[PDB]
From a paper:
To provide a molecular foundation for understanding the PDAC activity of HDAC10, we determined the 2.85 Å-resolution crystal structure of Y307F zHDAC10 complexed with the trifluoromethylketone inhibitor 7-[(3-aminopropyl)amino]-1,1,1-trifluoroheptan-2-one (AAT), which mimics N8-acetylspermidine24. We treated full-length zHDAC10 with trypsin to yield a heterodimeric complex, designated zHDAC10Δ, comprising the amino-terminal PDAC domain and the C-terminal pseudo-deacetylase (ΨDAC) domain. The proteolytically nicked zHDAC10Δ construct retains substantial catalytic activity. The crystal structure of the Y307F zHDAC10Δ–AAT complex revealed an overall butterfly-like architecture with a pseudo-two-fold symmetry axis perpendicular to several α-helices defining the PDAC-ΨDAC domain interface. Interdomain interactions were mediated by α-helices αF and αG, loop LH (which connects αH1 and αH2) and the C-terminal tail of each domain, burying ∼1,700 Å2 surface area. A close-up view of the active site tunnel revealed a canonical HDAC active site at the base of the tunnel, with AAT binding in an extended conformation. The trifluoroketone moiety of AAT formed a gem-diolate, making asymmetric coordination interactions with Zn2+ (O1-Zn2+ and O2-Zn2+ coordination distances of 2.1 and 2.5 Å, respectively); hydroxyl group O2 also hydrogen bonded with H136 and H137. On one side of the active site, gatekeeper E274 was close (3.7 Å) to the N4 atom of AAT. Opposite E274, there was an additional constriction contributing to PDAC specificity: a unique one-turn 310-helix ηA2 (P23ACE) resulting from a two-residue insertion plus a two-residue mutation in the L1 loop relative to zHDAC6, effectively lengthening the narrow active site tunnel by ∼5 Å.
This structure reveals that the conserved glutamate gatekeeper and a sterically constricted active site confer specificity for N8-acetylspermidine hydrolysis and disfavour acetyllysine hydrolysis. Given that HDAC10 is a PDAC with catalytic specificity for the hydrolysis of N8-acetylspermidine to yield spermidine and acetate, it is possible that the functions of HDAC10 and spermidine in autophagy are linked.
Author numbering: 1 to 364, 412 to 434, 437 to 453, 455 to 676
């Protein structure tokens, strides 16, 4: 039962710097480290995190990913003067050395191990390490690209040996390719390495053909190395989210990592002189959030790059915000990925399709308000509450007279409860989300949505779980309706998405692929002000409630996390699961998910072809030119 978020940091790692004029290395300054921590303090985030002390990495730990020949060469640098430090730096590609850099490199390595021990010993839920020098360019016998030792490589090897881990996911969202990490795990199918990076047809540093999408791994580890090259600059939020939805996330949940490590470099953020991208710092609150259902939340974030001092702290804060569980900012303006990004996304999916079958194509502190039935007390997490007002009961009496004949007082209580929690979610912002146990489905749902439009909730997303007619139409304001059922139907409207999954053992896999590839792209582009989750009696405790905790966790990326959930009937297990995932707890893994049955893959692709014209964030192929 892990608790909070670790923040490993030490100011000693800022006590090395460039000592000669060297235009390639001028951007790597100690101020990157002090600005990232000071920004965490100004916004009160550091004080909220469990500080963990920085230790040195033992030379046996360093030899996990490096050779004695190179370690002993670095170990001799603290005795060098400046002229000897230049002579040693010139032996390597874009990296300087300092009398103190060997010391700090051992701290950056040990700090990463400290973070691994913290998360793996269930001492913390997750954590971030603010280390310097970076890691992912460092190779077995050479320093490269400001890196001395591969901090992320150690963590994965350290977590393998000392915790007997079989499946580790490494996500490298730094704008540069982490060839050091690729080389280290090239033939290793236990460490899935994903990296997007500014490539520009190999014209951008490090200018390696192995950085291209062709490198899917060697030997038994082929298919466990995924490169996504950005071939043009100016990539935006829609590009990064299309990369997650249609490349990284489908592979990650099938892989089911036992631990997620992140090469977090924020030179992929707007304003950075090296990445020249256009993604806002808020995007990293979502990249983080979309990964947290993996590995029961066990997530280690290690600082890599990020060179614009202003935009850097903003991106660090968004990551720690999400790491602590704060509501994710609403991302607006999302649409289709540019044609270059779609080109790379389409190529990676095809080259990886021989290893991941879902990529194949056909030939051409109050957070949650819990409102259960009367006289049933329950055990609720620390940040959970309970229930009515007269202005509410008056308004419910107004609603009851004008639109309903409604007599039962038990469902008059729920209508007053639904309104009360909705007003606290929007107008007053006290709570984020809530759950209400409901008897009458059609009235509760139709009253909830109609009251939400007056809050005002501009656009509402409605996720319905069950068969039969929906209690809400496509007309009630700006709404997008999503139904998960088993009754085969073919919808016509562009704001409706009906997913008829084929019941059985593979209901778990088809759901997740439909969530990451269809539901989440549309919802993120829709940008709802409120999410309305519904589940009827017929679908409760049944086979598709395995993914429900995952959906209600991932869907909180929309609408600042404001999600009202209406449970029909009463299931103790179900209400337990929704409230936990609404409250921010960790989600139990689903195990290694096989590929869904091709009968569901086809229905999903028919839905994608139907909506990707209107909702361009569904596209994972270049647009056919007209
Ligand atoms: N001909 C001159 C090429 C200079 N290119 C410098 C690229 C440095 C990349 C470092 C980084 O941002 O990946 C890290 F995270 F490691 F800091
Ligand atoms: K990268
Ligand atoms: K690998
Ligand atoms: Zn970088």
């Amino acid at each position: 039962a892990a608790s909070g978020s670790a923040l490993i940091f030490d100011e000693e790692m800022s006590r090395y710097k460039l000592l000669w004029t060297d235009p390639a290395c001028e951007i790597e300054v100690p101020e990157r480290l002090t600005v990232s921590y000071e920004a965490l303090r100004t916004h009160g985030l550091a004080q909220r995190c469990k500080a963990v002390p920085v230790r040195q990495a033992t030379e046996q730990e360093i030899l996990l990913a490096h050779s004695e020949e190179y370690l002993e060469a670095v170990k001799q640098t603290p005795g060098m003067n400046v002229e000897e430090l230049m002579a040693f730096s010139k032996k390597y590609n874009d990296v300087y050395f300092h009398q103190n850099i060997y010391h700090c490199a051992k701290l950056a390595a040990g700090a990463t191990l400290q973070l691994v021990d913290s998360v793996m010993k269930r001492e913390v839920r997750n954590g971030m390490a603010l280390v310097r020098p970076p890691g992912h360019h460092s190779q077995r016998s050479a320093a490269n690209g400001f890196c001395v030792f591969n901090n992320v490589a150690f963590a994965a090897l350290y977590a393998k040996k000392n915790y007997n881990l079989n499946r580790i996911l490494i996500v490298d969202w730094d704008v540069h390719h982490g060839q050091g990490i690729q080389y280290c795990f090239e033939e290793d199918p236990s460490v899935l390495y994903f990296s997007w990076h500014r490539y520009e047809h190999q014209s951008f540093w490090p200018n390696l053909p192995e950085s291209d999408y062709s490198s899917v791994g060697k030997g038994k580890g082929s298919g466990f190395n995924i490169n996504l090259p950005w071939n043009k600059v100016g990539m935006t939020n829609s590009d990064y989210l299309a990369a997650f939805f249609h490349v990284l996330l489908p592979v990650a949940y099938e892989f089911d990592p036992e631990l997620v490590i992140v090469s977090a470099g924020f030179d992929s953020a707007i304003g950075d002189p090296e990445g020249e991208m256009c993604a806002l710092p808020e995007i990293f609150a979502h990249l983080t959030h979309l990964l947290m259902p993996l590995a029961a939340g066990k997530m280690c974030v290690v600082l890599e790059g990020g060179f614009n001092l202003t935009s850097l702290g903003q991106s660090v804060c968004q990551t720690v915000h999400s790491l602590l569980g704060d509501p994710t900012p609403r991302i607006s303006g999302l649409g289709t990925a540019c044609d270059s990004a779609l080109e790379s996304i389409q190529n990676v999916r095809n080259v990886q399709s021989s290893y991941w079958s879902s990529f194949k194509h056909l030939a051409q502190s109050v957070r949650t308000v819990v409102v259960p039935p009367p006289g049933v007390e329950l055990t609720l997490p620390k940040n959970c509450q309970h229930s009515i007002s007269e202005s509410t009961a008056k308004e419910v009496q107004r609603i009851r007279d004008k639109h309903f004949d409604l007599t039962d007082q038990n469902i008059l209580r729920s209508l007053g409860n639904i309104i009360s929690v909705l007003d606290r979610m929007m107008r007053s912002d006290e709570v984020c989300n809530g759950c209400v146990v409901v008897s009458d489905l059609s009235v509760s749902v139709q009253c909830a949505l109609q009251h939400a439009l007056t809050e005002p909730a501009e656009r509402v997303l409605v996720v319905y779980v069950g068969d039969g007619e929906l209690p809400v139409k496509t007309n009630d304001g700006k709404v997008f309706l999503v139904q998960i059922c088993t009754k085969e139907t073919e919808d016509k409207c562009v704001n409706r998405l009906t997913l008829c999954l084929r019941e059985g053992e593979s209901l778990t896999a088809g759901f997740m692929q439909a969530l990451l590839g269809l539901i989440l792209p549309v919802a993120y582009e829709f940008n709802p002000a409120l999410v309305l989750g519904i589940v009827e009696e017929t679908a409760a405790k049944t086979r598709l409630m395995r993914v429900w905790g995952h959906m209600t966790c991932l869907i909180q990326g929309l609408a600042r996390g404001r999600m009202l959930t209406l449970l029909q009937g009463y299931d103790k297990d179900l209400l337990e699961l929704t409230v936990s995932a609404l409250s921010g707890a960790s989600i139990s893994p689903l195990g290694p998910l096989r590929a869904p049955k091709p009968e569901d893959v086809e229905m999903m692709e028919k839905q994608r072809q139907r909506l990707q014209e209107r909702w361009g964030l569904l596209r994972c192929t270049v647009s056919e030119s007209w």
